């Protein structure tokens, strides 16, 4: 499960997962800001709960 769509959720293969992770890292690099790290930490705690 890697995507969303109206009336349902969508699926993909391993290549989609690797490309998505690479794109997430690249956009993390291009748009750095303190807001990002604060949100990341707090959302990590909530996700663990």
């Amino acid at each position: 499960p890697i995507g969303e769509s109206p009336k349902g959720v969508e699926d993909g293969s391993i290549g989609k997962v690797c490309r998505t992770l690479l794109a997430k890292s690249v956009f993390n690099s291009l748009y750095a800001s303190p807001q990002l790290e604060g949100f990341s930490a707090e959302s990590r705690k909530l996700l663990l709960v």
């Binding site: 769509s5 109206p6 009336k7 349902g8």
Partner: protein
């Protein structure tokens, strides 16, 4: 452009199995109508290349036809004079056969030229 149609249709297909607004059934058909019209229009404007090429070839034959008539005429008078100026039966037999062949071929060329226009 053609691939864009497939993406647009695939994404609009998923707004109908999750919602109403029959307007997504009213726009999802006009789109396929335009697709069919465009890929029909394609080969039609594609064919115009061959037509003008075909027309050009029909211009050269019309101008060889001109030169062939003059050749036939001149050779007719020359062979008639040679027939008039000879005194050997072999030659007159050959020239009889010639004149017959020239008349037949001239008639056929005239008929074909009339047909071409």
């Amino acid at each position: 452009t053609v691939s864009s149609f497939q993406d647009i249709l695939l994404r609009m297909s998923k707004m109908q199995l999750g919602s109403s607004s029959e307007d997504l059934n009213g726009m999802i058909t006009q789109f396929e109508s335009l697709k069919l019209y465009r890929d029909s229009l394609g080969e039609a404007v594609m064919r115009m290349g061959d037509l003008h090429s075909l027309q050009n070839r029909n211009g050269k034959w019309r101008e060889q036809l001109g030169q062939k008539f003059e050749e036939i005429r001149w050779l007719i008078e020359e062979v008639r004079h040679r027939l008039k100026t000879t005194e050997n039966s072999f030659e007159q037999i050959t020239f009889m056969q010639a004149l017959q062949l020239l008349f037949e071929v001239e008639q056929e060329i005239r008929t074909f030229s009339f047909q071409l226009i």
